[PDB]
């Protein structure tokens, strides 16, 4: 029973076996380790589909190019707010004056931080999974398996 679910799971199994032949190795004689969720925490940075994935890249460039056009204006906005509310231009920078991060700096350190590549990869994974769930609920029953086959990180 549940013929379609088994079809999809058997497809995922045969693809996993094909990409990694050592998965057939039984009795754990292989060097591949099967880990449930809580035990994959120190490896989440390694699961990165940087290639064969372009939407997060376009999103990052679009956000950067949009932020770069308003950073200096926003700095002027807060400068004027401080100058009106105190009469001095260092209302917001008194405690920190160090480094005053503008909107451009905020965007740069949000996109160039650690976990940024992981958060782009998992955003793509979630987007594709939700698309597949919507397609399955509608009843397409075709092409419901996505393979990214990225080097060093295979995801189905």
């Amino acid at each position: 029973e549940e013929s379609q679910v088994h079809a999809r799971l058997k497809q995922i199994r045969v693809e996993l076996i094909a990409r990694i032949p050592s998965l057939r190795w039984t009795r754990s004689q292989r060097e591949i380790a099967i880990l449930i969720w809580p035990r994959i925490l120190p490896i989440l940075q390694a699961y990165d589909l940087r290639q064969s994935m372009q939407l997060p890249t376009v999103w990052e460039k679009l956000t950067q190019s949009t932020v770069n056009l308003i950073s200096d204006g926003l700095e002027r906005v807060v400068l004027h707010i401080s100058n009106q509310l105190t009469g001095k231009p260092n209302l917001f920078t008194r405690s920190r004056a160090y480094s005053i991060p503008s909107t451009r700096e905020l965007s740069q350190i949000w996109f160039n931080n650690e976990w940024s590549g992981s958060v782009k990869t998992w955003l793509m994974i979630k987007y594709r999974m939700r698309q597949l769930i919507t397609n399955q609920k509608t009843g397409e029953l075709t092409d419901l398996v996505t393979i990214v086959d990225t080097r060093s990180t295979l995801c189905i």
Binding site: I81, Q84, L85, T86, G87, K88, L91
Partner: protein, 108 residues
């Protein structure tokens, strides 16, 4: 009666039940689906290029108080409904723009 009807929870399961037992029309279905695109298209008329506007709007400047601009904007926005009659009892000064503060330090 509006308040009692607003006492309803409006939960995801409740919304799904409402959509099931009372399906939306095709036009309503499409508008709910493409609300985002319609909203962006609606903004495209104001955030794209300088449109040709009535001339008395040149009196309003960036130096005009926000309350005056709010009066003019509400008068012009509901012009079809109100036919030029004013709206009263609404406007309240913006907190930051109302106060002209001054911090006194030592010999200041």
């Amino acid at each position: 009666r509006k308040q009692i009807q607003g006492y309803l929870d409006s939960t995801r399961t409740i919304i799904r039940y409402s959509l099931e037992v009372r399906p939306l029309s095709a036009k309503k279905l499409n508008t709910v689906i493409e609300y985002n695109l319609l909203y962006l298209s609606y903004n495209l008329e104001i955030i794209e290029k300088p449109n040709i506007v009535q001339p008395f709007l040149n009196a309003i400047n960036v130096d005009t108080c926000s309350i005056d601009i709010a009066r003019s904007l509400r008068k012009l926005s509901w012009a079809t409904l109100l036919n030029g009659r004013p709206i009263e009892g609404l406007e309240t000064p913006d907190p930051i723009e109302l106060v002209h503060g001054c911090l006194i330090i030592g010999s200041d």
